[PDB]
Amino acid sequence: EERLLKVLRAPHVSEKASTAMEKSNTIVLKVAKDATKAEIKAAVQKLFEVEVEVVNTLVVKGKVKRHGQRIGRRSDWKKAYVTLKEGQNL
Amino acid sequence: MKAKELREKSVEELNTELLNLLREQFNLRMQAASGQLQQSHLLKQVRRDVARVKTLLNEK
Amino acid sequence: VLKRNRSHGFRARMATKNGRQVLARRRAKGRARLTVS
RNA sequence: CGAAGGUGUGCUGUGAGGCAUGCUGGAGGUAUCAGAAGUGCGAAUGCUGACAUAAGUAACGAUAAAGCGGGUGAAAAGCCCGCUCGCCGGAAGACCAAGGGUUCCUGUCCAACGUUAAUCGGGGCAGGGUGAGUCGACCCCUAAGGCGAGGCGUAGUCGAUGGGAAACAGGUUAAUAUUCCUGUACUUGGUGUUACUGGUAACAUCAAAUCGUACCCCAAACCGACACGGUGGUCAGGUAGAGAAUACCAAGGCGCUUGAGAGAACUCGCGAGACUCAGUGAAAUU
RNA sequence: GACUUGUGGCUGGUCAAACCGGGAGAUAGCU
RNA sequence: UAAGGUGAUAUGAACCGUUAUAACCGGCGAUUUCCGAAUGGGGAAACCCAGUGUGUUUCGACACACUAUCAUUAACUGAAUCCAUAGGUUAAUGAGGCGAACCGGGGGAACUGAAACAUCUAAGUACCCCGAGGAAACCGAGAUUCCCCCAGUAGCGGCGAGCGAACGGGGAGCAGCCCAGAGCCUGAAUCAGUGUGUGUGUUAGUGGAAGCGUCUGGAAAGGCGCGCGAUACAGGGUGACAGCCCCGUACACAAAAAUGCACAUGCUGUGAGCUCGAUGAGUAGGGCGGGACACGUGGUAUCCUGUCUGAAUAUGGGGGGACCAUCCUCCAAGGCUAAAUACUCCUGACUGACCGAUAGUGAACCAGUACCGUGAGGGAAAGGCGAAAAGAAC
């Protein structure tokens, strides 16, 4: 049961998520590196006590900035578009 | 608190470890990301508590 | 990447005893880039 | 009640010098009797760092064409926006496979980065990461070519751009779609019911991973500083014609990286170059 | 049809024994 | 040790501690990714899939454990081929790692002056491979090696340049063992390994005496007058040059864990004294066929001896600074031997007629850097922050 509690990290809010929230009712949040489609779906049904429809998984490469005279690179984080039905709470 | 749970059995100490992760760990992270977590020291305190409980499980 | 790491990579030198001496100097002089990728 | 060094002057000594004071500066310094060296600098095209003359001059380049209007700003010759005809245009176009891994969208800012300016931007910062069981094929099996315990290539283990269940199209973006919403069609397991004799057919329900994905892709954003060139592969529309020439140089992407007067000889066909001029802005030699 | 693409094998008098490091802070008495 | 902290560059915002649950230092446990010698199969050091066997409030999800080899010991099983042997399974022990200097073993160069020349020196060198170690290997007398001497010697060479020994002595910072052992007698003497307790040390800490004031200057570590201290003035920092305003030194104390050098007791221990014996057989020499020892098979000593053969124990051999002779010792397959001396990549203390940002080390800070090249090799510049940031409200 503890596996489904460490799959999420922090909610992702942006200008694109606010548009699809009032149209298709789909929220997006940042998850960990793992967390397949069977672990993210089972976590929303208990933590958010709401029903979903489809959960997608995709990983993006970390951006590389030019901070000072030393090169730096961040990490890769996975996102997921939590698609809800007609009645949601948050 | 370090020796308070040192005399606890595995089942009950495993349970509080479960509760520490489910509540006050996941919820805190959401609040911090969303920006309504005024006080951040809770994240430090809960993380250390989880480690302290976890080491006792392995030690026991 | 394709025809660059198969002949000039890290595993290309550890497969024989002659290439082991090449990577030995990289350990004493640890640059920012060990091998190309 | 102002050290040494640096920076002036004066005095002293036939040798290289040493001593005093003033200005600047405000923290540790030196002589006599000795000794030990990386030991006093005008050149070896000496090496490093900081700087002249040449010269505010030459130069404005692998070649479609400038000018007029309006808006923003203290400042608009050149940037942004709008209208008409002709230079580009089966390719100086777009979509895949590499390299690169946030250079593509938005907002703010103009020091550096860019052959001038550059309020723009391909610059910096912030906001904003690109929806996938039916987008591409992974795993496994097979051919050529390899590997292959013994022996000195057999039995096996492996290796696809073909054969390998599916979806052809449209709408919706400020930036990226064939996916989510809506309408339709097809296939492969498990479970429950019915029919036929575990298998088949009809109806319903549940489950099905990871990686890649934008911009660039025929020369601008990538590799020789002036496309002083090299550069894989896919699609030959409508009319006319025997064909891929020619004819309507169609539609779309858009229309040299920068101005104003004058307009020899020579060259190319009143124009296009050269020379003299705002601004910006060099090397060799000595 | 002497088209094009990918992999592997055979052939070392300019990739046909290039550069750097060690020998070597070597070594030409003249310049 | 409790009157403070959440490393530094580098501040703010956010918390904890106050009549004993803060932080920092030391010791004893649990815990301690993918990937890199990486062993399940490939491979690109961070791309992709785990195979088999249990338990499980989850017959659809996870975590943990075991398996590329070779060699040794024990148990079990098994072909050609009746016995033996190869292969396969389980358990235990041992280890296929990388980076200096020095030493040893197996291989192996050029350039300088050479009268001339494949004579020679330089040079059993630089560098590189495998493995091991903590350092390596005619006056006398039989562990061994290194340093200090004999000694730029007595010799050797177209006696050209070079290369190159020993005994004695001056210096002892050496400590000389076990087996071939039957019999009367064993848990002996001398010692080692593995536990506990006491005493003495090493590796983290605390207590620890000693200058009060005035003039000048914004500020006093120096000056004048009067004292304390001194087993302690070794050095550096504390607004200008500091014993006594701080941080370090005499003296006096502590042991929950681990380790090293003498001593009580216990278990397993290759084992002495006295008496009765012995002092090391496939060897030397000779014959046939090769190579390495400077020497082409020489006038040729010594070292190594595959295959086919073969003696002796004062009736055989070597040595006494080597003709022949004499007396004593020695006369073939055993097993061991510390420290000092070699070597300086890491820690703490201490030292200097070395240096102070073109010096010293590529590199005094974000130097094994930015940048360049297919990879490897090779390879720059840059602090003079101020005592305290008082680093400009309007």
For B9-45, the DSSP string reads -HHHHHHHHHHHHHTTTHHHHHHHHHT-----HHHHH
Query: CA of A65 and C1' of F281: distance in angstroms?
Result: 87
User: Distance between CA atoms of A73 and A33, rounded to whole angstroms?
Assistant: 17
Contact criterion met (CB below 8 Å) for A57 and A80 = yes
The method recorded for this entry reads cryo-EM
Rounded CA separation B53/B51 (Å): 5
Q: What is the resolution of this structure in A?
A: 5.0
The CA-atom distances, in angstroms, between C22 and each of A21, B16, C14, C33 are: 58, 54, 9, 15
List the A26-31 sheet strands across, edge first: A8-11, A26-31, A78-83, A58-59
Structure-token pair, residue A62? 């970390």
Backbone angles phi, psi at A9, to 5 degrees: -125, -70
Instruction: Determine whether the distance from the CB of C30 to the nearest atom of strand F is below 7 Å.
Output: yes
Nearest Cβ partner of A1 from B18, B25, B33?
A: B18
CA distance A90 to B8: 38
**Which residues, at least 6 apart from A28, have a Cβ–Cβ distance to it below 8 Å?**
A12, A14, A17, A79, A80, A81, A82
Supply the Cα-derived Rg of chain C in whole angstroms: 10
Using alpha carbons, select from A37, A24, A28 the residue that is nearest to residue A9. A28
Q: How far is B36 from chain A (nearest CA, A)?
A: 12
Lookup: nucleotide whose C1' is closest to B3 CA: F21
